[PDB]
Amino acid sequence: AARRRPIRVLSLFDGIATGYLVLKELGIKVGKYVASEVNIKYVNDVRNITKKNIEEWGPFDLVIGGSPEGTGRLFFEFYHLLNYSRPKEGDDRPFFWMFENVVAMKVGDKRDISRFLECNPVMIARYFWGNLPGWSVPVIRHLFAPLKDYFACE
Amino acid sequence: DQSREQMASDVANNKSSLEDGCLSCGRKNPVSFHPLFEGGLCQTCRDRFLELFYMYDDDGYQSYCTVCCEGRELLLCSNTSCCRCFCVECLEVLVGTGTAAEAKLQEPWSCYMCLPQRCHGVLRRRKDWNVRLQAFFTSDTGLEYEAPKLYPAIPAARRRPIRVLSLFDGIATGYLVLKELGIKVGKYVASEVCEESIAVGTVKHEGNIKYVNDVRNITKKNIEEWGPFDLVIGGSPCNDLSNVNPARKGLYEGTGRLFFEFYHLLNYSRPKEGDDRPFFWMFENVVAMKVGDKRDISRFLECNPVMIDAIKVSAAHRARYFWGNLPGMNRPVIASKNDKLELQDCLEYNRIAKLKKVQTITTKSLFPVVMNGKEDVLWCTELERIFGFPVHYTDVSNMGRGARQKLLGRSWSVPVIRHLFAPLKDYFACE
Amino acid sequence: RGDEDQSREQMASDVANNKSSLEDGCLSCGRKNPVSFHPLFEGGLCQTCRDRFLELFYMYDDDGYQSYCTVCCEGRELLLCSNTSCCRCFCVECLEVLVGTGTAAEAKLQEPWSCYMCLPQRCHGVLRRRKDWNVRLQAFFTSDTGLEYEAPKLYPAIPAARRRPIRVLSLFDGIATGYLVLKELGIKVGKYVASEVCEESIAVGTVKHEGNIKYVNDVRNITKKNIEEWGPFDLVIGGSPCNDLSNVNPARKGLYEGTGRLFFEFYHLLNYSRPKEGDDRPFFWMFENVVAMKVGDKRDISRFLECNPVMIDAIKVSAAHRARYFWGNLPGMNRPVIASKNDKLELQDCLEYNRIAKLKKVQTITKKQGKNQLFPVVMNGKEDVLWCTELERIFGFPVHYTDVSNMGRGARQKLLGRSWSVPVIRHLFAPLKDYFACE
Amino acid sequence: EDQSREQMASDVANNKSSLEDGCLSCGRKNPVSFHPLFEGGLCQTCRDRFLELFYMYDDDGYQSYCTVCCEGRELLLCSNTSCCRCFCVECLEVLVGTGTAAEAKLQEPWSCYMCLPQRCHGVLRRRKDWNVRLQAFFTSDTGLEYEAPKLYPAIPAARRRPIRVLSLFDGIATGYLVLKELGIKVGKYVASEVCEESIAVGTVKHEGNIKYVNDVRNITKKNIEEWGPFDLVIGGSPEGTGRLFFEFYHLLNYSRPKEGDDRPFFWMFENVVAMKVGDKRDISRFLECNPVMIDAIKVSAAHRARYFWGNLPGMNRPVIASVPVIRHLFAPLKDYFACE
Ligand SMILES: Nc1ncnc2c1ncn2[C@@H]1O[C@H](CSCC[C@H](N)C(=O)O)[C@@H](O)[C@H]1O
Ligand SMILES: Nc1ncnc2c1ncn2[C@@H]1O[C@H](CSCC[C@H](N)C(=O)O)[C@@H](O)[C@H]1O
Ligand SMILES: [Zn+2]
Ligand SMILES: [Zn+2]
Ligand SMILES: [Zn+2]
Ligand SMILES: [Zn+2]
Ligand SMILES: [Zn+2]
Ligand SMILES: [Zn+2]
Ligand SMILES: [Zn+2]
Ligand SMILES: [Zn+2]
Ligand SMILES: [Zn+2]
CATH class of the missing domain: 3.40.50.150 (Vaccinia Virus protein VP39)
Incomplete structure (x- = not known):
């Protein structure tokens, strides 16, 4: 704890x-650090986030x-x-x-x-x-x- | 921005096909096709064609041009059980110059699908428009x-x-x-908020519908009270x-x-x-x-x-x-x-x-x-x-x-x- | 003010003290020479009042209340039967003259009211109710x-x-x-020949009965040849x-x-x-x-x-x-x-x-x-x-x-x-x- | 579109329009019939009033309204004896020319246009054979x-x-x-009348089997069957x-x-x-x-x-x-x- x-x-x-x-x-x-907009990481936009993306990068x-x-x-x-x-x-x-x-x-x-x-x-x-x-x-x-x-x- | 004139002239010479010709646009490199005639459509024209096809004006005819979906006024087909209207400048550039006025001076006018026809100019119909148009909207x-997972029987x-x-x-x-x-x-839990509509469900269904309230008032706790x-x-x-x-x-x-x-x-x-x-x-x-x-x-x-x-x-x-x-x-x-x-x-x-x-x-008549x-x-x-x-x-x-x-x-x-x-x-x- | 045309209180006192009866005078103006009976109460009516009991009796307001007194059919004043199942109303001029002075005073302030057709039957002075007022009302409008x-001819069976x-x-x-x-x-x-001129009634009778009835133009444009052709x-x-x-x-x-x-x-x-x-x-x-x-x-x-x-x-x-x-x-x-x-x-x-x-x-x-x-x-x-x-x-x-x-x-x-x-x-x-x- | 009376008068003065193309009384177009006194059309809104408002005479013996318009704003009597023609102010001054009504209203004794023989003073002319047009307008028109009813033998x-x-x-x-x-x-001889008294043959010295009767509300079919044929x-x-x-x-x-x-x-x-x-x-x-x-x-x-x-x-x-x-x-x- x-x-x-x-x-x-x-x-x-x-x-x-x-x-x-x-x-x-x-x-x-x-x-x-995870971010998504179009160690701050920028990869893609909010509009192209899928369920599988959260599965691989989450929780x-x-x-x-x-x-x-x-x-x-x-x-x-x-x-x-x-x-x-x-x-x-x-x-x-x-x-x-x-x-x-x-x-x-x-x-x-x-x-x-x-x-x-x-x-x-x-x-x-x-x-x-x-x-x-x-x-x-x-x-x-x-x-x-x-x-x-x-x-x-x- | 190549205007449709020279490609319309070239395709008549059989130097190529209309697989690269955007009928409503002219510009080459199409990402899709056209489900009425032989040819293709670019992305920008395809977006407008998806939306503007399926409405109908108060006169009982297609509001805009079938091919270009642009213009302020054009000819109107006058055949019963048909409502499609063609464009004026879409004809004298592609199918042939001079047919825009000879058909206007005589009545009744018939659009190119009302009358059986051949490949006039470079406007050849799709042999399967009935099923080609259907697959344009569902098979996007x-x-x-x-695919969804089928539940066991x-x-x-x-x-x-x-x-x-x-x-x-x-x-x-x-x-x-x-x-x-x-x-x-x-x-059956319904959430109608119209007094005239509730009196139809109450009287006709003998009060078998649990009319509750406005949709926006149903909070989290109510679902398990009424559900699952x-x-x-x-x-x-x-x-x-x-x-x-x-x-x-x-x-x-x-x-x-x-x-x-x-x-x-x-x-x-x-x-x-x-x-x-x-x-x-x-x-x-x-x-x-x-x-x-x-x-x-x-x-x-x-x-x-x-x-x-x-x-x-x-x-x-x-x-x-x-x-x-x-x-x-x-x-x-x-x-x-x-x-x-x-x-x-x-x-x-x-x-x-x-x-x-x-x-x-x-709502209007x-x-x-x-x-x-x-x-x-x-x-x-x-x-x-x-x-x-x-x-x-x-x-x-x-x-x-x-x-x-x-x-x-x-x-x-x-x-x-x-x-x-x-x-x-x-x-x-x-x- | 004359002998033949005596006031209401004169006949009321004459019948109260047994010097006269009620079936000899009119109950709305006190005149002599009765010509009929009163269908509801006991008494008579004069030819001026019988010829207004036949017109204004079956007239009601828009709110379901009689416009005129039940006795005299003259609305000098109007107080209603506040109880339901009644549209009746009794006028003030008929209350104190026959029932008793000051009756309308308590009849106005006490709430709710109940008309004399609602109360169990009594004899409130000279205003009394017959045992079979419905049967006499049914014969008032269809007799004398x-x-x-x-008698119209009766055809053989x-x-x-x-x-x-x-x-x-x-x-x-x-x-x-x-x-x-x-x-x-x-x-x-x-x-079935029908003569109607309203464009909606034609629609109802055409749609609902599947065109089994034949229509004709205005009734002011029907000659005798038409009736000869369409008959018998x-x-x-x-x-x-x-x-x-x-x-x-x-x-x-x-x-x-x-x-x-x-x-x-x-x-x-x-x-x-x-x-x-x-x-x-x-x-x-x-x-x-x-x-x-x-x-x-x-x-x-x-x-x-x-x-x-x-x-x-x-x-x-x-x-x-x-x-x-x-x-x-x-x-x-x-x-x-x-x-x-x-x-x-x-x-x-x-x-x-x-x-x-x-x-x-x-x-x-x-x-x-x-x-x-x-x-x-x-x-x-x-x-x-x-x-x-x-x-x-x-x-x-x-x-x-x-x-x-x-x-x-x-x-x-x-x-x-x-x-x-x-x-x-x-x-x-x-x-x-x-x-x-x-x- | 609706033309005024003065404009219509000016148009007729120039002979640009015929006399059978508009109503004579209201001055508007769309005739339905003809006018009996002069020559001129009549609209249905104006035509119907003429068969019912032409022979209104008072007990004194004058026309109730103007002989032309029949709209009684004013009346100008004719001084000639046995004449029953009246004139207003507008029907002449507006129609046949300005000052005509004023001039015709000053010369005493005054003679109406009907009294004097046929003359075409301005844009209004009397018909040549109006005597039969007057009768044709009213009866069987x-x-x-x-x-037609049959003719009995002799x-x-x-x-x-x-x-x-x-x-x-x-x-x-x-x-x-x-x-x-x-x-x-x-x-x-069985006489009768609207409400009156019922009596025997004796009311005056007249004795002609006159079974005088009161109000017709007393005669029944039995009476007619008995008193007749x-x-x-x-x-x-x-x-x-x-x-x-x-x-x-x-x-x-x-x-x-x-x-x-x-x-x-x-x-x-x-x-x-x-x-x-x-x-x-x-x-x-x-x-x-x-x-x-x-x-x-x-x-x-x-x-x-x-x-x-x-x-x-x-x-x-x-x-x-x-x-x-x-x-x-x-x-x-x-x-x-x-x-x-
Ligand atoms: N705020 C609200 N809360 C609940 N219902 C609403 C609402 N606003 C509109 N509605 C209802 O939503 C309906 C949308 S029209 C769709 C009606 C339905 N699909 C049918 O079978 O006819 C309207 O009839 C309206 O009564
Ligand atoms: N000039 C006319 N000729 C024939 N019918 C007329 C008429 N003028 C009015 N009517 C009709 O006469 C009707 C009288 S109301 C009575 C209708 C009938 N008793 C029923 O069952 O309802 C009106 O509906 C009206 O449409
Ligand atoms: Zn394009
Ligand atoms: Zn077009
Ligand atoms: Zn067509
Ligand atoms: Zn009386
Ligand atoms: Zn009274
Ligand atoms: Zn009561
Ligand atoms: Zn007129
Ligand atoms: Zn006049
Ligand atoms: Zn004269």
Whole structure:
């Protein structure tokens, strides 16, 4: 129940590639960095990810994405990727995720994405989602500080 | 950008063939073919030809050019039981110059398939257009997904009643089809939100449908309270993602986002790992929708859509994409001994049908019936016979022409659905 | 203020103190010289009041309530029977004068009210109720009016060996109720000429009956050669429009003018199409109109046709209020009406699934236009109105009868409102089976 | 498209349009018939009003409306005696030229265009033979083709029996005086009228077997079968118009001879011209006959324009100028009935 393996991650919109730097700043190393957009690794696009790709490259631990045209386009592709990368039913492996969205978005979208993710919205003049206890880098640093719960810790 | 003139001149000299000739485009290197005449089509023209073929204007004719699918005005064929219109400049460049005006000065005009013909110019028809056009839409290539795994057969004395779920229930076509096949329904949970539609399911089916609520309110916990399910039907609203309205919002905006309410709620009801009970599903939407989204519905469901046109079993023009994993969903369509193929079979007394096949029917309303020497139109009790519905089915809750026709304009076709659910009589209860 | 024209309180005190009776004075103005009886209570009426109890008795508002007092038929003031199963209303001028002063004072504030036809019978001074008011009401409208005419001739019975199909001429056909009823009985209709001018009734009668009935143009364009060619007819049926004959219309024209002239077309064609002198074939005919009409028009019609009407209410056989007059010479036309085992006698027997009726019988055959017009039925715990499929059941028509020519609620309801009633017509036509060929 | 009256007047002045291409009264195109006084078409919306609004005369003896438009905004009387023509302001000033109406309204005494002989003053000219056009416009101009009534045989001097009349809708004595001027034997006379008193032969010194009766609402078939048989039935206008016609029709139907009867039976019915077209066609259809006009201003002062629906012999024969018209109509009866 201690000294876990280095974490491996899958993400959408790696972008600035600051996730690896943030992870290394906390004093831990990432076991495998996986990304797909068109040791930050870029291979293909989100639109050409299949089930077998997740079978060969998974399983993962958490996902960093969000919505920094339409919100539905990226949101539902994110939902599909997360549903493909979900851990099998009736198991115990730790698993996290994350979704970002701007404040300016209609109430109907709030309703749909609260129904879909099955988690109630949480405000931060800022928005955050997910089941994780806890741009502008201080909020990501605050979220990644308790990362030791499911990381390498003796 | 080589204009079609010099290649049209060259191909007449038999220096090559039209396998490299894009009829609507001219530019060489085609990635596909053309299923009406001999020739090929490039990717850019193929994308437009996939979409723009299957609509029909209020005049009862093909909206755009058959070959080029472009132009503001062109000739209109005037032959009965035909509606295809040809382009003007598509003729004097390819088939021959001077025939655009000589045919215009004389009436009636006949398109090149109405009259038997030979290879005029370089426009030679495909000898098998009837089956070449059919394979263009169903035998496509998006990702060549794997075939579904057939469940092992279930013998007698181990057949349990089916627990049907239904989203966007409409006028309850699924229940009607399931009770005509002979299958024993043990439950049916519908999620219609229209007051006029609920009064049709309640009165006609004697309150055997558990009308629950809006689709968007059914949360996770409710499924196991009502479930477990065995058949998850669903058809999203088709008024947004279509090449008929100027708005034409995508699948991810507007009311087009009502598809995910089907996939997400299909995920919940499928059996967990270690469970080996039969489980089925199905989805349905319009074909006249952008090719940039046709490969999305197929990706999420991880299946390939079939095409079934109602003209093979009915007296109306309607064809749409069917997803799902029903057993034997790819078999050829065969009509029956109790179908209504032509208009004269679906008319009241003292009326004579001019045409033989109604064109596409929608919410909005040439006239097709003449009685007592006076031109007439179709009644509300005649649109029910076309689709296979029992007569007087919609005579409920004080509705007239403007309401008994809007509901039938967006429904399913009974004998089309009866073709998909037929192999469902082997895994569930019967009699 | 005179002796012959005494006030109401004078006769009330005279009968209260036993110096006089009630059957010698009029109950609406206090006059002497009674000419008739009062059908409900005890007393008499004067010729001015008997000739208004025959017009305004069967008139109801749009919300199902009588517009006039039940005693005097004069609405000086109106307070209603708040209890259900009653449309009655008693006027204030009749309460304190006969019952007692200040009675309307407590009758207005106490809630709810219950009319004098609802209470168990007593004698509230001089306002008392007869034991058999229904039987006297039935004879009020069909006795002691106008003159007396000779009884129509009765034809000898025809054996079943020699019987022929019935030939029918139907002026103002409507939606062909006569053909429907005659086929329901089981009489072979060998010919049926119908004269209608409405383009939708033609559609109904053409579609539903598979073109077995022959149509004719306007009734004002039919000559005598036409009747000679199409005949010999055997049953001349007809009902004239009542647009300008009913006393509901403020701008009435009555007979002799306007739309009321169309009775004379029936009269003329019936004279043309009847057997000549020295002919012994069975000829039957029938005419019908509304009860709420002036006595002058009714007496003129009786004088022209040479017979007295009978009143048949379509409430002992169905679930509606429908009072009409019937002139004719059909056999057994004045025998009491008894409902059959396959009669939908209540409103709940003519409803869809999951709908519950709050009443038992509906008012005059409809959608003051509040809290009783939008509330004849309940469904899913809410107020709802009747459906066209349910009106077709109330009137006794086959279901979905008017589902042709893609017409909506308004047109179907309009066609159904002015139609006939199938049970009444079947009762009238039942004895015809003894003269013509059956099945 | 709709042309005004002044524009139409200007067009006719230039002779760019004929006189039979538009309505004379409303000034619009699409004629349906011709105008009797002048030459000119008539639209159906304007034509129908002319047969019912042309002979409206007041008790003073003037035309009710303008002789041209018949729309009574204003009236200009004619100073000539026995003249019944009236003029408005627009029908002349707008149509035949500006200032014509003002000029014609100042010269007192004033002579209307009908009084003076035929002249074409502007764009309106009187017809050459309008005297027959006036009659052709009204009688037999519209309707069916009902077969003419048959002509009864004559009984020469062989037992001419006295007449016996049922006068219904007239004066009580009117119709009896005329029957006596010609010297015809009256074997019975059963008079009647709309609501009145019932009495014996005694009301005045008249003793002619006059069984005077009250309201017709008291006569039944038994009375007609007992008081008859009859040989002549009268009626006509002396509220509305339906009462008279329909009571007369009922009594005629009751008194009509049965099938196979050869004895003569004559009847009549008269009414003023000022009645709507619907009443005219209803009377013609019910009585199965067409009306003939007998213009009577020259033969009887203050009486004219009476239609007649009868089977009297030689009704439409030409006349050679209360008493006069009825006497002329009833004169042929001397051949069938008793004399002196
Ligand atoms: N928000 C919502 N929740 C539940 N149903 C809805 C809905 N919005 C639209 N619908 C229903 O979805 C239907 C789509 S039309 C498809 C009807 C159905 N396929 C048939 O057999 O006819 C409409 O009839 C509408 O009543
Ligand atoms: N001029 C005319 N000639 C013949 N029929 C006419 C007419 N004018 C009106 N009618 C018809 O006469 C009908 C009177 S309502 C009575 C119809 C009939 N009793 C029934 O069963 O309903 C109307 O429906 C109207 O269509
Ligand atoms: Zn191309
Ligand atoms: Zn083209
Ligand atoms: Zn063609
Ligand atoms: Zn009185
Ligand atoms: Zn009263
Ligand atoms: Zn009561
Ligand atoms: Zn005119
Ligand atoms: Zn004038
Ligand atoms: Zn003059």
